[PDB]
Amino acid sequence: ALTQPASVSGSLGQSITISCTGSSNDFGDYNYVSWYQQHPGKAPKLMIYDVDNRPSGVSNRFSGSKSGNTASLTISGVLAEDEADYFCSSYTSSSTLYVFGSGTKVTVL
Amino acid sequence: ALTQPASVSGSLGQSITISCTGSSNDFGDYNYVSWYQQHPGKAPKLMIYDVDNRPSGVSNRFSGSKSGNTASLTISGVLAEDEADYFCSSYTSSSTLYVFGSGTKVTVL
């Protein structure tokens, strides 16, 4: 179970951090965490993969880090279109399949 | 991109089929398409992986199949709790970016 905070709020131009906590040490040793941005209803878009790598066309405003048991997505210079659901995800044991975190609702004020 | 029908509706006890078509041949003959069930503002659950495999604890009402460049999730004996968003997903052909389909809103009447 990857646990995130239910919700976090931030004002335009401020910096918000979404934490992703896990029980086991498999992901916490090997850095296999990914971050998806989901606008309400639409497809989850990949923002970060392997802890801290951005696919081509993603704002450098989004950046990922990690510190043992918890990974973190930081969004700096928050815009209106950052209002969305955010999910962390690592691999299921001995597979390449993604299992998803509880998810964080981000409201932009 | 994996393109799905925007929405599908079915009555209780009926069968529902959701299609997942990909642009050209960018998804390695669609043998590694998975299917995720998502309740609103909730973590997407794995229902099917590798076209037709069912994880332990997933009802046998959910089954997957594939023909050419289209993968299909079928939900038998539709229950209330099948009312959800459904995304097909697969690695891009480069096997780094795990990309989600446009998504299908299943309404149960």
Author numbering:
A (entry chain A), B (entry chain B): 5 to 113
Paper text:
The LCs are composed of an N-terminal variable (VL) and a constant domain (CL). The patient variant (referred to as Pat-1) contains 11 mutations in the VL domain compared to the corresponding germline sequence (referred to as WT-1).
The primary structure of the pathogenic LC, named Pat-1, was deduced from the sequence of the complementary DNA (cDNA) of the plasma cell clone that caused AL amyloidosis. The two sequences differ in 11 point mutations, all located in the VL domain. We thus conclude that the Pat-1 VL but not Pat-1 LC is the disease-relevant amyloidogenic species. The crystal structure of Pat-1 showed that V81 is in close proximity to L15 and L82 opposite of the antigen-binding site. Focusing on the surface properties in this region, we found that these three amino acids form a hydrophobic surface patch which is not present in the WT-1 protein. V81 in Pat-1 forms six hydrophobic interactions with residues in FR2 and FR3, two of them, the L15 and L82 point mutations, are located within this hydrophobic surface area. However, V81 contacts only one amino acid in the C-terminal segment (V111). Remarkably, when we performed fibril formation assays, we found that all Pat-1 point mutants except V81L formed amyloids, suggesting that valine at position 81 is the main cause for the pathogenicity of Pat-1.
